[PDB]
């Protein structure tokens, strides 16, 4: 669907209203007033606009000449009011001291526009919507039509009244128009701004936002100025009221109004809307039918009425409660208590006069205690609060009891709120949000429901938009329909659509319309699963929450088929489709097809209720396991080797598989070891192996070796054992010793028996991976592969000659010492004398158990204890060295004795392990910031010793980087308190100290001033920076974030207070700085871990754009644009014009360069060059 819309072709719009009979929509705008159809087609356009005029002029140029210069100005529609009684439209403008227009209702024919007298002028004010009011009428001949109207004044106190009661004559040409209801030389039916109050508070003014007639009164929601809150302007939002039948204007009342949400103040009205609550909200808010209610919108605080805050709150007032606050306040002043308290009106405070009276809601004011104010600000019940997108407008309405609220947003969005405080729920909940002018055109206060209350016309600055109160048809499913909750929506069961009660035919009948999710259609089928091979199966259907279907029903499995059904009890009986029909579906989807079986109602002819219905196909299973041990009833035929639903389709009786444990499958034995190039048989076990039948061949073993696949015929001995015949196997590579290979056991050529455990054959070669005795006896005892002394290589007994009865050696259980251990290399080459070092020895022909190498390892004399977990048998020993303090030697060779220190079974390291004692004497900054992050350079001797290193400053750990013989470099942690700190370095079990070498933590540096407060796009200019403790950071640098890019540049520290910095380049091909200048997203300095200096909140640093230069005894003159920027202070570019290498003395001007020449020319300024 699309939202019906009227676009504002040229100008902004201001007001909208709907005619209660026709549904015609009238639209006030700047310079225009439109009549529109219900669907927002243009019907008629009135020009009201651009008028030659001037605001300063009293009576406008028409009546008297004005000395002030006139110009073509825009006429803003300030107000718009439907006068149904006199078949017309009051269309009050501005820009003529506020003269009012009368347009005829059905064609916009100007009936009248009075502007001779002073009353025909309303206000100079050129602001839209700061005005409001109501039209009230009696029958012709009686007390005639009146207009109550508030407007701002702009300080023109003596020209215009802010609030007035004015006359509406039947003749638009009649001069009496907009004259006051009762005028006297003492009191007139108007209320003026006192001159004394404008002298005191310069630009006090009353802005009227909303207005409505209620019972017998007239209310206004207003904004005023600081008068007990010269200074600055802060506003107070108030309610005003009058009796309709009070020509004297004595009934005037004025209470401050707002509401609070968790200690946050909302005191600025943006809009309101008087309404009903309907049965729902009325009851639990405690009201009678015709009792009224006022929805409102407030912004946070009391700041900036011209441009309010995003923070906004929708509150609520019951009029009975405001009526009680006013009655309570009047029955209080008629007790003589306190003053009237109305700052702007009465400057000197007159007192409350006591008197005996029957104070009623019918009270219309009296002569003494006069116009009066309000002390107790009236608090409202909060409903919904937007924090990211400010509310702008509101409306509400009664729907079948439930109270729907409409809320415009600054974004151009409308919210559809059920108010549920009086309703069961925890608090009033948003139901739905909708889009009007998505780009961010705000919605305006004038937001009216249609007469039929089917739509809601939503006005923006630039477009009117017909938003339906209901569009439930976007909801596809009963479950989503009633899930949205926006109360207009119900599921019209038999039409399978989502819409309102009045739109669902026959909804009034039983179960035909669903309103709570529990009413949703629930369906079940008895035979949920039906086989492809079956046909016309009887199915029973149970359905609940469904109307009387005695109209008739069909079953449609999808848009493929449709079978007739008959009704009995609370059940529906229909048949499955034919095999001829079923397969057209299942073809392609294989294993199974889940299909949504619907019910098609005869009355509607639309599918409404559904179920998961399964069409299973046994035949497509191509193995016993899939067939039986699947999820379905399927039978496997051992002999035909096919899966099917029918027992009889099997070969014969004794070949039917119904149980998964009875399947043809290969069972595992202890691993199948196969040496390459050796004639071997491979016996297998299995279960229920078939006797090959008529015209059927015997068994084979197929080996899936990528290099060569071997086909070897086999013999089936019984239902439980196989054997491939004497053969040898190979693969071409010599790359991997142990290759596991997929084998498939076949019979009758292509029938592959099932392999559940996926049993493999391991093809092993005698080592192409092991040229060391220790490596062979290390590998599987299964391979049978062993080490053969004489050859100096390793192969089976098979492949090695027995010249001695013990010439071929195999690790019996691992009780096999391996001759000639050798050490290749060992890590840490150095270590501390104290020990604790983890020595990492890597050899080739070591022992095969740990408990033999344990006790074997020694470093010269020093006993070394080996580690279990970190020991990799006969390749690697990890060993922990003991205390070597007592050793005389400085360095010693490493020794391993395999089990016994026998003369052939000992290894000695090729180069020797060195003992030292590392020392340190200097640190290369000795100072650094408390936050830390300083690159420290500890100098000493033997610093690269051992395994682990840990540096601790104040007990807190340093982040390590790299190690050297002479240097340790690490990054400092944050210090607890500033000053001297101990440096503790521990290498393994050695903990070395020096109290003469300390580290001094320094108070965090500060940045005060950058001097020039600017630079160009490519940067590179000098910046004279000032602050504190700047010598405590060795390498500080400037940081700047422009757009999505972050960039850095260098600094040179001079004093503890002074620093020269080279400005960061922000060169971005996406954004260029404007001629005016631009602040970066972030600007700061990188100083170790002091992170508060990375981002500068107070900084006003600006970036200007990068010079334009024109090419080809008298002096040189070089012309061009952008030579000098509009920069603060003196600060300008240090230009240098050079010739081959010689610089000149030049005076720089804004368009020209005055170099001096004696007769290849290069101009330089920072990092800029041009020829
Ligand atoms: C439920 O699902 C089943 C199974 O998924 C399915 O039945 C299939 O129906 C379609 C028809 O649309 C068949 O597909 C066509 O096959 C045409 C030729 O079929 C020959 O080859 C068959 C395949 O042999 C394979 O499977 C066996 C066992 O697993 C395996 O050992 C082999 O190595 C091999 O991989 C073979 O089964 C078939 O023999 C059947 O028919 C005879 C006579 O009725 C019967 O006695 C046998 O018992 C057996 O059922 C036959 O020899 C072929 O023309 C065609 O291929 C063309 O089109 C495609 C697509 O456009 C191209 O890609 C291709 O290049 C060709 O141009 C097509 O593939 C399929 O064979 C059936 N499946 C089986 C197992 O028979 C049904 O949809 C469902 N059942 C019902 C009742 O609805
Ligand atoms: C640690 O060292 C740092 C830096 O190394 C040092 O900071 C400077 O200290 C020197 C003195 O040692 C000061 O220089 C003196 O300035 C006297 C006149 O000041 C005027 O001129 C200043 C320099 O102009 C240069 O820089 C500008 C801007 O970069 C540039 O446009 C020019 O082309 C020119 O190269 C100028 O900055 C200064 O403006 C300051 O004051 C204003 C207003 O109060 C303020 O708003 C600014 O923020 C700015 O600070 C002003 O216009 C000058 O008389 C004096 O010359 C005497 O001394 C020399 C050498 O000893 C003698 O030969 C000679 O006979 C004179 O007696 C000298 O040139 C300079 O002011 C300091 N800089 C700053 C930024 O304050 C710190 O003092 C040292 N810190 C500590 C703690 O010891
Ligand atoms: C395929 O569709 C079928 C629709 O028929 C689904 O079958 C139903 O499956 C559920 C469980 O998945 C069963 O519910 C259970 O009922 C148990 C009691 O079972 C007895 O009572 C059954 C009805 O009164 C009766 O059918 C059943 O007899 C069965 O077993 C006999 C012996 O093996 C056999 O000879 C008969 O032919 C028959 O199959 C028992 O006497 C109860 O203990 C459980 O707690 C559970 O509630 C339904 O009973 C099944 N319906 C039928 C008609 O058998 C099936 O789920 C679908 N398959 C898949 C994979 O989804
Ligand atoms: C570890 O580092 C800190 C910080 O860098 C070292 O303290 C600094 O020592 C240097 C020496 O180079 C001082 O500079 C000298 O200051 C002498 C006079 O000091 C007074 O005047 C200072 C500047 O006007 C003033 O800050 C300081 O007051 C400080 O101490 C007060 C009492 O403890 C304290 O309440 C204040 O807040 C303030 O921190 C002195 O009154 C002067 O004779 C020299 O001419 C030279 O300028 C710095 O002032 C010291 N800076 C700081 C921040 O304390 C400390 O010595 C280092 N530790 C070791 C063991 O070396
Ligand atoms: C101005 O606004 C009016 C309404 O404010 C509007 O005119 C209406 O149009 C609707 C359809 O948008 C019409 O309603 C129809 O009523 C007849 C019965 O007389 C039905 O047959 C119609 O049903 C059809 O449409 C259904 C929904 O699309 C289909 O499901 C169905 O199959 C039918 O095809 C439909 O309910 C109606 O005629 C008028 N309203 C009135 C009161 O006459 C119009 O959009 C706007 N016109 C202009 C000129 O701007
Ligand atoms: C509920 O179910 C009933 C029964 O299951 C079902 O009745 C079906 O009605 C249609 C008519 O709408 C029958 O189809 C006809 O059969 C003749 C042969 O006897 C065909 O020649 C016709 O097919 C032509 O028209 C089709 C549609 O335009 C074309 O697709 C086709 O090319 C032909 O030109 C004719 O339609 C059908 O036989 C029965 N079904 C069965 C199983 O007999 C009905 O749809 C449902 N009832 C209601 C009230 O909706
Ligand atoms: C099905 O047939 C299989 C294979 O033909 C039979 O497995 C065989 O079981 C016999 C025991 O009778 C094993 O014989 C043994 O051999 C060793 C020789 O090293 C000998 O020392 C023992 O005295 C014993 O005779 C034989 O290894 C094994 N066959 C193969 C090929 O490994 C099985 O008995 C039959 N199963 C049923 C249920 O009938
Ligand atoms: C040797 O056999 C193994 C195991 O049988 C093969 O590896 C894997 O084979 C399985 C089949 O069981 C594949 O699994 C598949 O996974 C998908 C997941 O989407 C599933 O939909 C299928 O039903 C199936 O189970 C798996 O892809 C495959 N592994 C790899 C990495 O491809 C292996 O292919 C055989 N070796 C050689 C050399 O052929
Ligand atoms: C077969 O079913 C068994 C028992 O339910 C289960 O343990 C196993 O996962 C299934 N195996 C296969 C291969 O489907
Ligand atoms: C081949 O297998 C047969 C039967 O298992 C056996 O008698 C013979 O020893 C095997 N021959 C060789 C060379 O391995």
PDB file of C-alpha atoms and ligand atoms in Angstrom, residues 678-681 723 725-726 798, ligand 10:
ATOM      1  CA  UNK A 678      54.169 -57.222   1.649  1.00  0.00           C
ATOM      2  CA  UNK A 679      51.889 -60.119   0.679  1.00  0.00           C
ATOM      3  CA  UNK A 680      49.181 -60.198   3.363  1.00  0.00           C
ATOM      4  CA  UNK A 681      45.612 -61.437   3.921  1.00  0.00           C
ATOM      5  CA  UNK A 723      38.921 -62.138   3.906  1.00  0.00           C
ATOM      6  CA  UNK A 725      43.240 -62.669  -0.560  1.00  0.00           C
ATOM      7  CA  UNK A 726      47.049 -62.587  -0.431  1.00  0.00           C
ATOM      8  CA  UNK A 798      60.776 -59.867   7.080  1.00  0.00           C
TER       9      UNK A 798
HETATM   10  C1  LIG B  10      49.024 -66.646   1.749  1.00  0.00           C
HETATM   11  O1  LIG B  10      47.842 -67.000   2.448  1.00  0.00           O
HETATM   12  C2  LIG B  10      47.711 -68.386   2.714  1.00  0.00           C
HETATM   13  C3  LIG B  10      46.349 -68.645   3.360  1.00  0.00           C
HETATM   14  O2  LIG B  10      46.090 -67.712   4.388  1.00  0.00           O
HETATM   15  C4  LIG B  10      48.862 -68.891   3.595  1.00  0.00           C
HETATM   16  O3  LIG B  10      48.862 -70.303   3.625  1.00  0.00           O
HETATM   17  C5  LIG B  10      50.242 -68.413   3.124  1.00  0.00           C
HETATM   18  O4  LIG B  10      51.160 -68.535   4.193  1.00  0.00           O
HETATM   19  C6  LIG B  10      50.263 -66.975   2.587  1.00  0.00           C
HETATM   20  N1  LIG B  10      51.464 -66.769   1.793  1.00  0.00           N
HETATM   21  C7  LIG B  10      52.332 -65.777   1.998  1.00  0.00           C
HETATM   22  C8  LIG B  10      53.513 -65.735   1.073  1.00  0.00           C
HETATM   23  O5  LIG B  10      52.208 -64.926   2.880  1.00  0.00           O
END
